[PDB]
Structures are given as structure tokens and as C-alpha cells.
Amino acid sequence: NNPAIKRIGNHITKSPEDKREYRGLELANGIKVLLISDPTTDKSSAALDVHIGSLSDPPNIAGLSHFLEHMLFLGTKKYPKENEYSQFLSEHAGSSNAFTSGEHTNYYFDVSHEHLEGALDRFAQFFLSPLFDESAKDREVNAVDSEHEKNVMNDAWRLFQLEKATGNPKHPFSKFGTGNKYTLETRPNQEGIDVRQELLKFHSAYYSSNLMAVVVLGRESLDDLTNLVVKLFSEVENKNVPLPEFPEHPFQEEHLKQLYKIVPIKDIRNLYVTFPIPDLQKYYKSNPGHYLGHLIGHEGPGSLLSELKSKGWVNTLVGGQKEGARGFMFFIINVDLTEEGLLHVEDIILHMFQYIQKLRAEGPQEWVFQELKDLNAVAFRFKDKERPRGYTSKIAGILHYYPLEEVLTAEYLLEEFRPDLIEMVLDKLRPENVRVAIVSKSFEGKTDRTEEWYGTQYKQEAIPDEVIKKWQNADLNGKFKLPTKNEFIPTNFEILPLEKEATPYPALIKDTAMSKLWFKQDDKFFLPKANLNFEFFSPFAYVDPLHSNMAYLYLELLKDSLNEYAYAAELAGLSYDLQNTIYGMYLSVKGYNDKQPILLKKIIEKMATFEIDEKRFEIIKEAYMRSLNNFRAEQPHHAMYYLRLLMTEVAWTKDELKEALDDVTLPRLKAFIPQLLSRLHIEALLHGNITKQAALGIMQMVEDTLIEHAHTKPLLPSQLVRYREVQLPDRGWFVYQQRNEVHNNSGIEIYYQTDMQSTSENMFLELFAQIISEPAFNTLRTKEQLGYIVFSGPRRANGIQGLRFIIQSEKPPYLESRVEAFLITMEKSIEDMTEEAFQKHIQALAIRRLDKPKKLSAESAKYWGEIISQQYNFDRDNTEVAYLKTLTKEDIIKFYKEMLAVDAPRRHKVSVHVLAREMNLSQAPALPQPEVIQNMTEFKRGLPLFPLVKPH
Amino acid sequence: NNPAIKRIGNHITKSPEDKREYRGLELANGIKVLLISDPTTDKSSAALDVHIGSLSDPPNIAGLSHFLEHMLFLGTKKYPKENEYSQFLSEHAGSSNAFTSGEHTNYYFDVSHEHLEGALDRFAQFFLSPLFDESAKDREVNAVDSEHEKNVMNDAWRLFQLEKATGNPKHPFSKFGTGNKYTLETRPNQEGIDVRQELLKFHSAYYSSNLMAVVVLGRESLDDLTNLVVKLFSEVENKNVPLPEFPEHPFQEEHLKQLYKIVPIKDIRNLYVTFPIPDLQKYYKSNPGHYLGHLIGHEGPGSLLSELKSKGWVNTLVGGQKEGARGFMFFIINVDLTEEGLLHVEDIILHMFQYIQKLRAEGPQEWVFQELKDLNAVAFRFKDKERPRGYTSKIAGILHYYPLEEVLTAEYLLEEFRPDLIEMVLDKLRPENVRVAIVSKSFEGKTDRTEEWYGTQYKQEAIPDEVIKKWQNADLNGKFKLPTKNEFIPTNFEILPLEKEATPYPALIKDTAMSKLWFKQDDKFFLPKANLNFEFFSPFAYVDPLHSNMAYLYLELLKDSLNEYAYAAELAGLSYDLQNTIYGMYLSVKGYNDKQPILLKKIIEKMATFEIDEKRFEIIKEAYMRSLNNFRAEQPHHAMYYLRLLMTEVAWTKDELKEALDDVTLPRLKAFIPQLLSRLHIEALLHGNITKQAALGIMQMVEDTLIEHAHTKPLLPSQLVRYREVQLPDRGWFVYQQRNEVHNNSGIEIYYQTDMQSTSENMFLELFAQIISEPAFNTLRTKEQLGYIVFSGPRRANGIQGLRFIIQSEKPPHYLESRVEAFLITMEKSIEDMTEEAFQKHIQALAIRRLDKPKKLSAESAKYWGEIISQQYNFDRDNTEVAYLKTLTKEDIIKFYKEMLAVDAPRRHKVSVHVLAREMNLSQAPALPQPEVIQNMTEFKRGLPLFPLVKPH
Ligand SMILES: [Zn+2]
């Protein structure tokens, strides 16, 4: 054996169904590596995880470890061209990205399996000699600063950082993770530090091989992927860094029995109960936290959630162990509050302790643990094949925590039942060590403290002893039961053999006035699973604001009443999704095909005979009101929204929906339901491990239940229509504008309508999109630093398509001239790019479109698309790619001069401008003055609507 | 004195609101003449009525006098061009027509006021030197045969002739009016007749001056008009023809007590009860007929219709005197029948005699006469000014019947109260001389006779003698009472003073979420009337075919419920039109403004607190079902209908409505109403003898009433959708094809769609429309004789427009197309050849047509209502558009034709609808492209862009 490989991992315990081929190993220098050999993959992929992150930033430069992560993309000693990396990845059908936690910096990529070597080499250089270019450091600090601004008004982060800022300040937990202009440029300059150096020290100090794990997946044999990793990663230095432990919990004596009152941005009510605990990671084999999470989290009859829900105090609850770092964790129970629940916080919490007391009173349930084990065992036997890129990144992450031979199984299986540990953790959940946080708009004005980084308005009190004492005496309550034995565990996993009459694509197999049924027995994956998808068209779902509203409430309340029942099902890997659409309703049922009919029958049955509950109805309606209102507080790309509204024939606005909400009275909804159901068409796609005649019987029962309980009759053919896109005039240019009252950043979509989707008109657009893709990111973000979110690519809607640009910025939408200026740069670029450059792109688009589906639901979505889009072109990718391969540099250009260029005979252009709360480089073209859109419906009315697309 | 005039008559009595000046005179040769001077009129008119008609047809050339009427239009000695007259009229903003009843032939026209003299000259010649060209006679005989085919399968015509054919056949009344090709060309050639002689002979025999009345209306002084009429009509020859009289009734004592059982074309159910009466005409000062008419026909509490409808047997009823001819008349009482009703005819007729008995038992009522007299006197005082052509035609007719001084007032005012004439006519409504027809599909198969001219299937029977007896024995039935006093009779007639800041066009005086109120106070007509129009928007009334069904049903049951109470108001000259539209509902209240808010309020209250009778729901639905179904018997030129369906964004078919009509249960309607009414928006035009504030209150009162009782609130602005027209491809051509299963002609509509309506696009279209207007009629009908129904003109929908042709024909539509297409090339050439001055004539002709001032409130209203319902709000459109029209040149129209209309126009957009018959030289046609045959209406529409909606003003 090789002098550069300290050890070899074999065998690597994997799923019984998993045809990929694993060998792990430890290099001389101390890198733990997993290699995955998949001879049939279209995309190769690799990831590296360094066991350093945010929690190790020097205290005088918050965000350094995050910022470093941003920088390693921007050029290395071997490959100085600042975007050589991300250009290579896009010229060969690939993509890359990274992230930074408290203890991890994780970097991943994928690429056309044929250029795994190129990509990997470019990538290894991040860990050998990054340039940290002085002038690139100066630009990209803004990208980070943008990232932070985006999050400043997100409530999740406000809270995330708030927790950090209310524990021990001297603890590295309290650190600002994201960093920004002040932490990373302004303050270090004033403080006399040199940032580029500190990067380099940091990199040098912590990016040591003893702290890295690498996963590399490709088509190559295990032996070849070996010499390839060894060749590339043997050189990483081993600095021998000691791996950081944080053994002292950030919440000390004084940080406990504290109540926090917090003003949100959105109109949200929320309660965050939280207890500090020791680091349960080392007991991964028995997993006590998960066991107690399973119980406290449960949503079945007898659960905490149920009682709280039944008293009208909460809607949703999550609970379980929350990750901390090596040496400290959390156990949480969060709920959202109703109006009434906000008035009864002390009570809700007493109930939380009463549940906990029940568990103590009964002690550790072995059958419950056994159940959890067997569920996991099955989950794992029949795990879906992952997308390589995510797979490598995840795995590279967990190599730090498990022996090479155990990585695949490790975060899946549970092994010994450990009652003493369940009992040591449970004993940690008590009144005298709890932290409570309430979040509500009604604390507006009553706060005294502003959190430093986000500006969060809050107040902090000691929870009075009388209240803590009252919670310790929490007795049992006969409303709390342990869960009954999960009914929906699927016993039977037979894969039925491929039928004689079986097709490669879905066949239409029932075509009645009542229902069209697309069916395909699964020919690729061979798991005991099925996907059952149904649209139920009825004009009545979206005919008008009030009706949308009701179509929505109806499904929510239905889902809500069903949730106690469906939860056990969902745990047993059999789940469903049901929502309203613009056309009437959608229902998907996915999972193990064994208990699949039972649940389906329940859902249909239940919708057709639904008793609404007044109290329930009232809570949900109010939540929904708030939810509609809270949209004023999303991000500036809002831009996307208005674009949707402007371009579609029918589209109800939030303001419209919220006007009509006041007049959904209980009777009117009751009346609404059987009306909605009286006339329908059903288009279904049933894909997976079921047979032609089994499917027929499925569809049948579905229908029959409807005919029976809701007297459904078929809909008229003419009364079945799709909606249309607005047809923009030639050489025209409109601009609509709003403000965002909440984020002090601005946003913008620019939309270049082209024509109706066809083979050719699609590929022109797709390929142009391909070519510009990364130049777009490089010019608009990397060079010009217009903001953290910059985006280009196709827009497809109602059968029409165009090109879109999205940008979020500190700048005003100006943003336009830069997008227009860029666009000319692209004109010059195509005129100069070589034939062999050009054919690289065609090949990228090619591999990308033709990449085979990995799991059954990836493939169901592919036909779903075809079916709802009413195009039915199941062989699309082959036609389209064959045609693609015919396009010359000449064609693309002509397409550009005709449709996109500043002065195209046929340029159609809309631009949405969301202005902020408060409102050298290449040359921009002079633009016409736009016709400003004063009113949205007026806009639509004075313009043609395209045709609906014909069914190939 | 004057040789040419036998006498001027005295003051001609008029309403005192009638600003027109009038002279009646009798000419030397016996022509009774009325002359109207209106120095303000935009069009002038004249009419001539000849007291001869199809009752005087030779018995062996049926229809000859109808056919003569057709032929006076095609040439006289002084003006011999086959179409000189109809062309002179087109070129000077005139129209023209004629009709032939049993005893009259009536010829009328109008023209630009400037050209009354030349119009009239051309017209007098009809009565002096008609040519009856041999080669025109040959062609036009087909126009008559078409006219008749059209009537063959229509039910009213069939019944009309069937009554004529079961009277005494030896009687003139039994004749066949229209004639056809068989009777006017075939039968006479077989029997060696020269029709041109018999036309010439009949005209010479009967168009004699002693039997003629003339009315002429122009700006000219009354003297000027006198000189004119003397000039052109003194030379009409007086043959002193005895005026024919028909003393003996055709239903003699032998054709009485008959039951007739008729198989109808449409699925209808009807009973016609009919008694013969003497001629009541001479008794016009008292009107015994109309009094019993008014009584029997009443729809108020305690009336006949009222009980009959209560026992769920009948739905509507008419009754009164039907006109006969000099010598005979009829009294009729006709009902339609419910399903139950067809099985209780015997009882229904008894109820009729019970009511008649009541009238006999009560005596005649002078207080009822008195009511009738005032309603009439009020009606005449404040009668709306009539359009000149209708007016002259009408008077010309009634000059024969009444003294000169009395023409204007004779048909209106009452004078004498005659108990004895009432008793008299009321003694003739007895079972011993009754006639009874039941029309019903349930006699299909069971009928033993065929009426020669229409083919009508029927059976005839003596009414069982003790069925008569039982009706003779009808005692009074307590559900029947004479109507009480009529509280809706207006008394306040005060024209309000013309307000301080009032305006020439409607002003938007209210702009809320619930309503847009357009208001204009009358500044032209000064009659105590007002028009109140309302659109209720609710997308709910047309969301789906089912809801449309309810929109409709609801509205009918509501109209039905009110009927008993609204009827009173209607006789009081106060009426309402209420109906469902594609955008929710339309409600109009028209007439004497005095009691109007009483009625409007009753309508809104009712329609917002409605209780639906279970019985009347089941009945009306059955009737509505039939109605839908019955469209398959509507005329082939159906074509219009399929085109409306093919080009609107949204349209439910009669077939979808028919299907979805089964799932309209009583529970389900009861739900609909409150839903529909819950969110509305109202656009209204209140117009007339009302003040700003009076108007604002009316608008508010409507709103408020709905607010109270239907908890109504504002519709969201974006839910106020207008619909769109399908946008056709450049250079495309589609054909939809269907067949009419009842009718044995075929039909066609051709649409060359052009662009959106716009000042310029509109006048380009209208100008070309006008220029081709009569050449089209002349070519496609008169020369080519493709059919009776030949129409060309503009077509306006959902803010888009274009040129259309409708024809109804014997020939197939693959042939009609080619002749229209041929006419299109004939016309580009015509435009090319015509003098600049001939071109300006047409501009002027269209210009005048557009600028014609409205004569009555309802007409000005309509023009404003068009602006509003169409959301163009171009109230001054007529000067804007005319001003612009005067700019146009031959160049512009030629370019226009070549770019939009020509057979290979770069931008021709063509739809043709071909409706085939039950059973399926000349200028050069162009060779056509290959049509795309529209297969599925919905698919066709899905695959094409839609036009924008038009910008408001
Ligand atoms: Zn980042």
C-alpha cells in the first residue's frame, strides 16, 4: 500500500438497496475521506468540510470565518483568474456553493461527470494557496454586508441572534456570525488591523488537514478516485490544530428562570420555551434527545399539542433537541400563539410541565423506542437516491462525528435503548432551569433594551418565584396520553413485477368526462413507494377574491382537523400535501405504497363530509388575515409578486384577498364547500409501484367517494380553461413601482418577454440564458457589487416565456442601466467567443437538461410539469437537446438582435421597481422613457392576451 | 280660390306641446293629404297609403298586390334606372319601405331635409308611370318567394293563414296575401297570363287617386309644402273606384263552434279563443271594443288572467279586438298553457265566460270609461315626438278613416260613453258563437288535415253540444272582481325649471365604490317624463352556465311576482324592463316621472327580499326549457348566434344552458340570490324631468334598500370585467359550419374583422359601409336574387369592429361567399370610378345620419346609454367623429380597402359562419384560399390572442 494513506475503510455499511459503491480512508496528513463510485451518474460532485467556523472568529473581527468562505472562490495561486472556478463550473454543467456554521465550513460543487478532475483540482487549491486579493477583499465585503442586510429584518435571525446576546457575553456563543461592513472593514481599519492578513493567519492557522473531511463521488472506479484524491489532497498541510471544545454551557445560573418580551417585524405570536442541556452527541447510539423529542413533539391523540390546540391556545408546536456545539445543546418546545393563547402564557407552560411530568410518571417506554428503531431501519432500507451535490456535502459534514465505516448509517439508525439517559435528560427539563421568550406586536412601546446587531426591541424579567413554584407542582392531567401503537407502519414491501403492457412514459388510461388518468408503473427505482397526484379543477376555487379565500380556509381547516390522524401516517413515511390552486385543488400522496389507499380514502371522504368547527374556523381565519398582512414585510424581490400580478390574466392581490376575508362568515363557507365539489374534472398522475388495474381502482374509489358523499357531476369541457399571459407590444417598455415599508434595501425584476414556448423558441432562450448566466453573476455581483442577490435565467408562465433579471440592492433601480450595460458586454462577448467556447455551453445545457432523475418523485415532477402545463410532451428533453445541438453562434446572435438588444424590432420589456424604505466600469446605453404603470388592472385591460399553448 | 284643390280643412287639432305645424287638405282628384311643417327636422319624409290590398287580389293570381308593391321600386317612365329611387335615397341619407295588409298598400321614405323635393318627385312617379320591367319582374318574383319561405316555418304566420283558411273559403278573407313563385310565375305561365299586363292592369284599375292618402313632412313652410304636393300629385288619375266593403263575416254560423287542433313548429302550448264581431271602427269616439279589451285583458287583482295563473294553468293572456277589414272584426282572448293547463282547456274557457258573465252582471262602468279617457288624453298631450317616417306612414294610413281635422286625435281621445255599444258587443261573446284553437305538440300524429300554403298539420271538430251548454250556464265565480281605482295615474305634470349649473351631456355626479351616477336633466323635450337606467354588476350572474340560468330564472320569477301590481302602473304610462346580462343585471324605469319612485322602490325591495313560490318556479323553468330548445326553430341567419359565440371571450351556448338547467333546484336558487346581491356595483344614468338632488336621492334609495335587505356591499374595482373579442391572424380565414334542422333555407354571416374602435378606424369603416350599403342590396338581392334577407354593415362588439354580411338563401354558402367576394371587387372598382363629388355626397349622407337629433327622451337616453354600457363615455362622439369624417378622401378609403378588406389584403381577417338548409350572366368571383374549418368552438378560441379592451374618455 501507498505511503500517503494512513488507513483504509472497508466495508462501509450501506443500504441494502443502494447500488453505489463506497470506500472510505484516512490520508497520511489526517484528512478523513469517503469515496463514492457510481458508474451511472451524470453529475460528479465533491465536498470538503473543515471543522472550524463562526464560533472561532477572532473577537475583534466578527464574521471573519464567514468572509473567508466567501473569498476562497475568488482565485488561487494555481488559478488566479478571479472567477476561473465558477466559470469552469458553469462551462461544464456544474454549480458550487458553501456555508459556515459555528464549527463548520463546508464547501461543495458538482460538474459534468466527464470533468471531475478539472473541477476538483481547481477546488483543492482553495485549501493550499487562496490569493485573498486585496482588491477582491474590498469588493466582496459588500456581498457579505448585503447578506447581513437581507437578514436584518428577517424575524428568524433577529431571534437567532437574540438568544446569542442574552447568555454569557464572555462565551464564544454570543458572537456575531454573519459579519458586515463595520465588523469586517470599517472597524478593523479604525482599529489599525489589516484584514487580508487576518484572513491568511486564520486560513493558515485553522485550515489544517487534521480538521478536514472530504467526499468525492464519481463514475470513476474506487481505485481511480483513490489516486485522484491522493494526488490532489496529499499536499494540504497538517498544522495539527486542537479541535475546539465548549464544555461550559453559555447559559449559566443567572441566565435561567428568565422571561423575554420581544417585538417582531411580521405580525407573529410565538412562545419559545428552551432548556439548556449537556452535549448529547456522544450518545448518538441511544439518542435520548430524539426519543423525548418524538414524545413532546407528537401531534397524535393525547399529545401536548392536542390539548393546547383544543383549548384554542396554539396551532403548531415543535420540540426536541436543538444543536449547539461540541459541549452544549438545547432542548426546546416552541409553539405559535393564538390571541387567546397570548393571554395565557403562564398556563400553556404549566401544561408543558404537566406533559413532562406524565413522562416522568410512566418512565421510559421501550416499545416506543423499538417503534422508532424499526421505522428508521425501514426508512433506511428504502432511502431515496440523493442528488450528489447535497449528498457529498452532508457526508463530508458527518465524517467528523463517526468512524468511516459508520457514516452512511450513522444519522439514520438507533441502536441501544438507554432508559437511564432518557431519564438524565428528562430530569434536565424543569422549571428552575427554563428560559421563556414571548414574541408579539403588543409589546410595542413597552421594551427598554435594543439588541446590538439587528436592533431587536426587547425586555427581560426574572420569572417570579411564585410562578416557578407553581410549575414544579405540576401534576398529571388525564388529557395527556402516551401515543398509541403507530397504525400506519407499512408491513408489505413487495415490488410488483413489470407488466407486459408497460410503458416508459405515462399512458393516459382513463379519459372520461369526470377524469383523465395518467399512469406509469415505475421502471427505474424499484422501491415500495408510489406517487399519487391529482388536480381537481373547478372555476370556483379562484373565481373571485372571496372564493379564493374560502377555497384556502377550507383546505387549511380540513388539513387541521385531519392532522391528528395523518400525523402517525406521516411518521410512518406515508405523507400528503393538499392545497388550493388558481384552477381548483391539488392533492399529492407520497410514500410507501402499502397503507396508501387507506389514507387517500380518508382524505377524499373527509373533504366530502367535512363538519367545520366554529372555534377552529375563527383561529385559522385570523391567522390567515395576519399572514396576508405580513407580506408587507417580505423581501424586496415582492418584485417577483407584482410581476406575477402584472403578467397573468387573473390574479387576486393580497389587498384584495384581505378585503374579502372580512366577509367569509361561517355559513358562507359551509355553503361554499358542497358548491365547490358539485362539479369537477380530475386530472391525475399515478406513478410508482402500482399496476395499471391497481391504478384504475385507485382513481375509481376517488371518484366514487366524491359521487357518493358530495354528488359530484362532471364539469363542462368549455368551462375548463387555463389562464393567459399579457402580450407586450413591440419596442414597448413599462415600469411599475412600489415601496417596501420594512426593508431599507431596494429590489427589481427586469423582464424581457420573448414568445410562446416551442422547441426552438425555448432553446434559443435557454442557451442564451446559459451563456450569460455566470457572466451576469460576475459582472453584477462579483465586480460591481450591486448586492448579495443577483439572478438571471428563463421565466416561464402560462405558456409564454422571457428572460428575467432579479436584483436586491442598496442602490436605486440605475440597477437598470447596469443590467443594460452588462447586456452589450454580452453582445461583444458572443461575437468574440470561439466556436469551441460556444460548444462547451451547448454541452453544458445538454448535460444539465438530460441529467436523469435520481428518485421517483424527481421523475413524477417531470411528468407533473408536462401534465399541469397542459403540454403533455413527456419526451421533451430528447427533442429539445437534439434540436439544441443544431444552434450556431450566428443563430443566438440573431435571436439577440431581434428580441433582447436595446433596439430590437421586437423588444418587449417590463420592469418592477421596489424602492427601499428610505428612497472605472463599462458604459450604459441610452434608454427610452418608459410608460409608467399607474394602475395594474388598467395596464392589463389595455393590452392583448397571448393564446393558450397547444398540446404536443 | 285654387282649381287643383277641393278644400283646405280647418285647424288640425294637436297636442299643445306639439311644436309642429299642420295643414290638412283634399285635392281635386280626391287625394286626402296631411302636411307637416317642422322647421327643425333633420330628415324629411312622405308616405302614401292606397286603400287597396291583398283582399282585392285577383282570385287567380294570389299575392299580386303584395307583388305590385315590390315592383314600384324598380323603375318608372320619368326615372327608369332600375334602382334610381333606392340609390337617390342612399346618397342623401334616406331609407324606404312598404307593406301590404288586406286592404292597404303603404309606401314611405325619409331623406335629408335638403332633398325632400327630389326624393318626393322620384316617389310620386310610383303612382303615375311604373314601368314593371319584364326582366325585373322575372327577378323580383324570387324576392317574394324568399319572403314567403322565411314565413313558412314561423308559427305566427302559420296560424295567421290557418285562421284565414277555415273561415268561408268563398270569402276574400280566405286569400293568401304574400304570394310566392308558384302563384306569381309558375301557375300564371301555365295558364297563359302575362304578369306584366296583370300588374299594369291592376295598378291602372285600383291605384286611383280617390283611394289615396299622402302625408308630407319637411322644413318648408306649410304653403311651400302645399305647392309641392299639388305639383307632384294633381296629375294622379281619378278612376272613381268604389272602395271595397266586406259586410258578411267570414266566420259565418257554420264555421262557429269549431275546435281546431294545431301541430306547431316550436314547442309551444297555446289556446286561441275567438269570437266574430261587427266592425267597430265607426265607433271610435267610444271604443266599446277596447273597453272590454281593457277589462278581460286586465292583469290586476281579481282579473281573469289572475285566477287562471293562480290555478297554475296559464301564464300570459291577451284579449281585445283584433282588426278584421271594413265589415268584420274579431274579439279574441288568447292564453299560453302550462302543462296542467293543456289538460284543463274546458275549465279555462268556462272561467272566461264566468268573467264575461261578471261584466254582464255589473253593467258597463262609466267610472272605467272615464279612467280610460284620461289616460288616453294624457298620453296624447304628452306623446313623444315620432321619427318622421313612422309618423307619415302611420297618418297616411289613418287619413282614410277619420276627418282631416281629427287625424292626430282620433286614435287617442275618447268622447262618448256608450253603455249600449258595450252591452251590444258584450252580447256577442257567448258560447254559441265561439271558436277554439289548441296549438300543441301532443296533436303530432293525430291530425287529419294539411293547410295548403304553409303545410300546417291540424284537425277540426264540432264542440260537443253539452260542452257548449255547460259554458252557457256559467254563474259568477267569486274570485273575479272589476279592477279598483288606478292609483298609478299621474297627476303632477310640472316640468321643473332648468337648473342653474345644468349641462348638455350627462355629468358623473356620484363616484363611490357602490355606484357611478350619470345625470342629465331634460333640456330639449320638456315632457313630464324621465328615464332611469341601471347596470348592476356581479360576475356571479354569468360565472358558469348554471349561474346564468339562475340569474335568468330569478329575474323572471321576480318579474312574474310583480306583474299583478306593476300592470296598473303600465296602463298609467309607467313601465319597467328588468333582465339579466352577461355582467349581472339591467333595470330600466321609463315614463311619467310622477309615480316613478313608488315603482322603482317596489322593484328593489322585491328583488332583495324575494320569496320564490315553489309552483311558479316549476312552471317557469319548464317554459324556459322549451324556450332554449326552441332556438333550433329560429331562422338560419343562427349564423349571427354562432358568430357571437365564436368571438366573445366568454359565452355559454344554448346547449350548455339546457344541460346545466336540470341541476337548478329550488334550494339552489334560494342560495344564488343572496350571494349575487351581496357584492354589487351600480352604474346608472338618470335622465329627464328630474333635478340633481331628486336624482341623487333615487340613486341612494336604491343602494340603501339593498344595503338594508340584502346586506350589499361594493364590488372590488378589479372584478368589474368587460369581456374581449378574439383577435384573428393576419391573412387568416376560418369557417364554422352547422345546419338548421327546421328551416329549409340556409344562412351565412361573413365577418371581415378590422381593428379596435377608434375615431379614425370607426369612420374608415362607416364610410365604406355607407358607400357599399345599397350597391350590396342592389347586387346581392335585386340583380342576383340571392334571397330576401340581404344585409351588410358594421359590426361592433366588445370594443372591436369590422364589416359583416348576412344573407338567407336557397343556394349553399360555399356559393354565397363567392358572390359576396365578387361584390367586394365590383366595389373597389366603383370607388375608383366615382367622381370626387359623388364621394363627398356619401360623406354628407353618413354625416347627416350621424348628426340626426333625437326626437324623444328615450332616444337621447339610448345614445348616452351606449356610451356608458360600452365604457367609452364619448358623449360628444358625433361631432368629434363627423368633423374627422369630412377629412377623408378617396385615397384613404382605397388604401383602407386594400389593407384590411381586399381578397389579398395583408391584414384581412375573415370569419364565415355557414348554416346549411334542412335538406343539405354575372360578374367574376375571385379564387379563394383554403379555409380553416373550425372544429370545436372552445379550441378555436383557446388558440388565438384576445384584443385589448378600449380606453375610456
Ligand atoms: Zn455568505
Ligand SMILES: [Zn+2]
Ligand atoms: Zn314584401
